[PDB]
Amino acid sequence: VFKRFVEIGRVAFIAFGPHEGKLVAIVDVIDQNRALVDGPCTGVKRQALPFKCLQLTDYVIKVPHSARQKYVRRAWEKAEISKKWEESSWAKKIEARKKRAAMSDFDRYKVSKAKKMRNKIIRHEMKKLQKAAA
Amino acid sequence: ADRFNKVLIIDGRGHLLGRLSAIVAKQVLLGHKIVVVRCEGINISGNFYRNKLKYLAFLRKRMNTNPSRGPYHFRAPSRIFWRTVRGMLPHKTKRGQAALDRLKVFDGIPPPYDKRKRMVVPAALKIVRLKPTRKFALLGRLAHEVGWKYQAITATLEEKRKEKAKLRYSKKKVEMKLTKQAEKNVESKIAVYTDVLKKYGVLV
Amino acid sequence: RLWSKAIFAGYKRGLRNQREHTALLKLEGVYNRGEVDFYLGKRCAYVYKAKKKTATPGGKPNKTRVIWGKVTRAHGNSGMVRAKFKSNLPAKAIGHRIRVMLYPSRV
Amino acid sequence: MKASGTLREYKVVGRLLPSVKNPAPPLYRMRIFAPNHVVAKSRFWYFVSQLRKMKKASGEIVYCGLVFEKSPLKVKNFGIWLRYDSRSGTHNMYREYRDLTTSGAVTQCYRDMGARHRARAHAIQIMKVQVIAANKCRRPAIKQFHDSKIKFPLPHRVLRRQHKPRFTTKRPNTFF
Amino acid sequence: MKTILSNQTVDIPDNVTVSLKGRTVTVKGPRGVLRREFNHINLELSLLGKKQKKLRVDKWWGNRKELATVRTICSHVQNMIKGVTLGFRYKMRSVYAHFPINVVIQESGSLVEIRNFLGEKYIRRVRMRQGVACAVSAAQKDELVLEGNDIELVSNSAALIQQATTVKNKDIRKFLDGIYVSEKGTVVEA
RNA sequence: GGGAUUAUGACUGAACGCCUCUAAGUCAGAAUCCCGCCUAAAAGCAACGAUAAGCGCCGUCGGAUCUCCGAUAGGCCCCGGGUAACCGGGACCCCGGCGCGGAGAGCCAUUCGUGACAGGAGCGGCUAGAACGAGCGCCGCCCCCUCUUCCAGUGACGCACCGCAUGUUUGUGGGGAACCCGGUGCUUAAAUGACUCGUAGACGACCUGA
RNA sequence: UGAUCCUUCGAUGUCGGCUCUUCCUAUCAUUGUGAAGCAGAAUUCACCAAGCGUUGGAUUGUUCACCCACUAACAGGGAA
RNA sequence: AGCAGAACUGGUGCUGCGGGAUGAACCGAACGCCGGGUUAAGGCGCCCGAUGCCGACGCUCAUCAGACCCCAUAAAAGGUGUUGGUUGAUAUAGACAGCCCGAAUCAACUAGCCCUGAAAAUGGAUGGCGCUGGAGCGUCGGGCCCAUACCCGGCCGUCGACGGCA
RNA sequence: AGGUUUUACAGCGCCCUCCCGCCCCGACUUCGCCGCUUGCUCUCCGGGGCCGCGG
Ligand SMILES: [Mg+2]
Ligand SMILES: [Mg+2]
Ligand SMILES: [Mg+2]
Ligand SMILES: [Mg+2]
Ligand SMILES: [Mg+2]
Ligand SMILES: [Mg+2]
Ligand SMILES: [Mg+2]
Ligand SMILES: [Mg+2]
Ligand SMILES: [Mg+2]
Ligand SMILES: [Mg+2]
Ligand SMILES: [Mg+2]
Ligand SMILES: [Mg+2]
Ligand SMILES: [Mg+2]
Ligand SMILES: [Mg+2]
Ligand SMILES: [Mg+2]
Ligand SMILES: [Mg+2]
Ligand SMILES: [Mg+2]
Ligand SMILES: [Mg+2]
Ligand SMILES: [Mg+2]
Ligand SMILES: [Mg+2]
Ligand SMILES: [Mg+2]
Ligand SMILES: [Mg+2]
Ligand SMILES: [Mg+2]
Ligand SMILES: [Mg+2]
Ligand SMILES: [Mg+2]
């Protein structure tokens, strides 16, 4: 049933906390509630972040447990996790949400006249296909 | 939601009795109008035999000299939840009595509300507040075994409400399927209007 | 519309002591203490309608009256803010609408 | 003792007051875990006073400083020998924990003794703290984390942030 | 202590097709179709294998009580497989000292009438459960066989008869009359 | 007369290779409990009859006048549900989506008017709706020509009321009656006192009859 | 039944019976069960349980006693 | 004994205020009339001001759960309910269980929460609702809530001045 | 317990070292792994509430 496990090397996304929004690599599992994550290519020093802050992604790297960040960095670049991440949808939803939150008042005006016209074009085509289907 | 809406229609299925009433009682004091539907779907923590004993012990609190004035033990799940909210309000005052008038409870979803979107309070749900290994008691079965006589008719009218909404959702799906097909057939004509949505993060 | 929605939740009280000189408000979209930093200082308004007609600045004398105030500080960790009006709000306004203007602006 | 926050390890050394009969008296070193140095000095005059004949007024504290962890980035298996006073009598106890720093491992012992045995901070007396290898661990709760290529999901993710949207139309999902 | 993992595999024979949609195991074979619903255990049931997949259950982070349900669910599926491959046969015999217990099977096995119990004029009419067929077995004096696919239905129906022929207001150590289960076998021996 | 169950006796079945009524899941079960039956009927309510130059409606168009009483300041956005899973699409499977953009953190509206020149896409029928029922839906004729929605233009004018508040919405709001105004409605309305009855009564009430 | 003396001495009518209502269970009987030095009958121990019943009389002002018969049983109490 | 009699100190009598639902005495703190700020004890699901923290760890299921000074009751003795801990004994010279099988098993003791022990009369009391990923118990972090208390300022009065004016 | 026996087709410690062999980051309030503070911490350095009474 499960497809994402907490294993040595599982790239996890930090949901909240100090390093909110940055990826880490689970290097070792301390307890049931904590893990020894280390993101060498993202900007997160090695520390004990709890599983409450982590969100498991679909990327695993080949690193032994409790290895230095020198070897974690090698497997992070060999599996090109940063390249696979930036081109994913969950990373593009974050990028799209940051754009909308930084919209000015002039941007909310230009974005309103667009969807007001874009929806009228689609809603006209929807009724055109609906009448023909009847 | 969370927008000071005119009428907050909260669904009752899956929610906990005291967890939902503690939030509903606070919204009615702020001036909002809450409409809790499907009060027979509310469930209480603890196994069924505990929650039934808690209500059977409530049936014994009648006044000795004249039970006609004693505690009115309502058997309807809506009136059971309505009294739970009343215990969390200063109903002896005027602001507490006016807050009860803002709350309207129903057993099932009546026609005035079967064509409305029902909200869900995640801070009062069973999956969020109770462990999966714990026992719970449904207020519908609890009410039926203490004197509620309208459980079968509510379940029969709820089945007609579901089969009448399933026919519309099948028409809502076939209308959205044409909307997705409409965008593919007109994508060459809305490319200028969709890029500004892509530029400002409206469309991912 | 150029005013955000608020709710007069009650007076600044303890458990069995009310202080009517300070009112507690309930902003619409502010549910954290860190989001009230924008509304600190904005002028409030308790707009109501009495029986008799009163003078209106910039228009004909209508049936509308207003009590002016301002947001002073934050109240708790749930986005509640305190407000001091010219005259204390009547107790019948508990749960009604309070307008939070966008001036004095700091943006 | 209050055991507030993280208990930091202090190296408190002390000695009797030098006199003409016993000049340069012996120095006694102690391994104290306390939230601050004010409590760490008082904890020193609690164990040394009952081991040797010397009070706070008869002796002096020569040094009281922090002892940092040499490897804060390495998971270690600790073993703590303690003795707590229950309602009936005093009992010796050996509990194993697992943390990155010895300051946080002893802190878990005070949280565990209070949770399982209802022992307050004044009843617990830490005697030995030792970084135990993964071969000499006696507790199965730590030995299960001694499996390389460890793998386990996070089933039934309980919804937090239950009040960011307080009302919504979507019920929370718990499978991720 | 929360054990990190506790699993148990259930190998299924080649003559059955065990399927599952979530936690609803459906076993189909030569004698019938069984279907249980395990939406109360909070486990996962993976069906792994190339040909005639095995049933593997798991329990992640389970305490001492939650791990007891791992073998229980595996033992229920084995009864579902055993009940469709071979079936269950709960045969019971009649015990009496003076008054012989006359048992007649009506409604094509779905009902059994018990008469002359301790000389009583009352007629005990016990109705079996759905899928359980009763019949007075031959090659024996007064034994009574019960057949079916579900073990919880054949064994419960055999208890309804035994609980019906109880002696009241008498010493049960002296009056050993009634219908007691003789043996719990199978229809097709294997 | 039923329902869920207590005590109790059991089923399946682990924990604990066995065993076990229990841990998950099930069964039988009683002068008890709840309900039915029965008694009362709420600052609870429905169906329906008749409604007196006088008395409503019509034509929510009232064209205008007055008085009151609350709020409010875009939305009446609808599968069922699961959570050790779920959703969408296509002829038990397959594909696709899954920290959930086929997203109530969003979506749908919406961004000042009046007069010319180019780009871009109000009555007739059928069917369904009764838990506390309508601007309900779908087609075919009439209506003039749409500030239709968006991007670019040119020349004008709508006090630009000289820094200032109660502005703006649902409001063509809900209630009492008032005043010329264009059409109807049916107007052989009921209750009560006294008398009578005695199936009923202390007095009222109640059952009746004229 | 004492012990105490907080309330009441510009007053709380005081023993028993009669009458009538309600509650408690520490269950005498009846309903459903478990146990025996339970063969049956009878009886004893215990459990869920106060729905229902728990009498007529001689003597005594008596509550309390004692006897006569009846009975499924003739259980024990509270509410100034 | 909410009884009678002493000793030290405090309180009360003579005293209001914040907290303990309620209250003579408990905890905090003693009081001219007010604005602002901040605390004590105690609190922050709702009544009810404040955790609407993505608080940390663990314990706990109760067919009479539990919920904190005085304080409004509970014991001896028990549990194969569950979680820790202490001291021993068996076991690939193959134990334990089962009618051969091939990896751990057994016993005593101890301490947490829960349960049995646990019966009274008008209907009823963690203060009420209610709460069981908690609104419970234990150990702790951050933030926040307000007393006639602390701080700053205005005003009245009293008191003092080694006080100022003919 | 990665690779086929202790480094090998990953890594994890501990010692002698080549000057601490050698450089760079200093509790990160200076790039969110962990403490204590000025040796008068620096800012027409920002924002909010409150009131300026007297003479
Ligand atoms: Mg202490
Ligand atoms: Mg007998
Ligand atoms: Mg029944
Ligand atoms: Mg049982
Ligand atoms: Mg049953
Ligand atoms: Mg839905
Ligand atoms: Mg797929
Ligand atoms: Mg033009
Ligand atoms: Mg209509
Ligand atoms: Mg057009
Ligand atoms: Mg006296
Ligand atoms: Mg009893
Ligand atoms: Mg006995
Ligand atoms: Mg007293
Ligand atoms: Mg005394
Ligand atoms: Mg005295
Ligand atoms: Mg004094
Ligand atoms: Mg109290
Ligand atoms: Mg003050
Ligand atoms: Mg409180
Ligand atoms: Mg015993
Ligand atoms: Mg055992
Ligand atoms: Mg042995
Ligand atoms: Mg107890
Ligand atoms: Mg001062």
Coordinates of C-alpha atoms (C1' of nucleotides) in Angstrom, one line a residue, chain B residues 16 18-19 22 26 29 44-45 49-50 60-64 84 87-88 95 129-131 134, chain H residues 45-49 52 60-65 122-124 128-135:
Chain B
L16 CA -17.4 14.9 17.6
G18 CA -18.3 18.4 22.2
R19 CA -15.5 19.3 19.8
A22 CA -17.3 24.1 21.3
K26 CA -18.1 30.4 19.8
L29 CA -21.6 34.5 20.0
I44 CA -18.9 10.6 20.5
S45 CA -15.7 9.1 21.8
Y49 CA -22.2 1.2 26.1
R50 CA -20.6 4.1 28.0
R60 CA -33.2 9.8 35.7
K61 CA -32.7 13.5 36.5
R62 CA -36.5 14.3 36.4
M63 CA -38.0 16.5 39.1
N64 CA -39.4 14.5 42.0
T84 CA -24.9 20.6 24.0
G87 CA -24.6 24.3 27.8
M88 CA -21.6 26.2 26.3
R95 CA -26.8 37.5 24.4
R129 CA -9.0 13.9 17.2
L130 CA -9.3 10.1 17.9
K131 CA -6.8 7.3 17.5
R134 CA -10.3 3.8 19.9
Chain H
rG45 C1' -11.8 23.7 24.3
rC46 C1' -16.6 26.7 25.2
rC47 C1' -19.4 29.2 29.4
rC48 C1' -14.9 33.0 30.4
rG49 C1' -10.4 37.6 29.4
rG52 C1' -6.7 29.3 16.9
rU60 C1' -3.3 5.4 30.3
rC61 C1' -9.4 2.4 28.2
rA62 C1' -12.2 2.3 32.9
rU63 C1' -20.2 -1.9 31.8
rC64 C1' -18.7 3.1 39.0
rA65 C1' -12.3 6.5 33.9
rU122 C1' -35.9 14.4 46.5
rG123 C1' -32.9 14.4 40.7
rG124 C1' -27.4 16.1 40.2
rG128 C1' -21.4 23.3 33.9
rC129 C1' -21.3 21.6 29.0
rG130 C1' -18.2 18.1 27.6
rC131 C1' -13.4 16.0 26.7
rU132 C1' -10.4 9.8 25.1
rG133 C1' -3.8 11.8 18.7
rG134 C1' -7.0 14.3 24.2
rA135 C1' -9.9 19.5 27.3

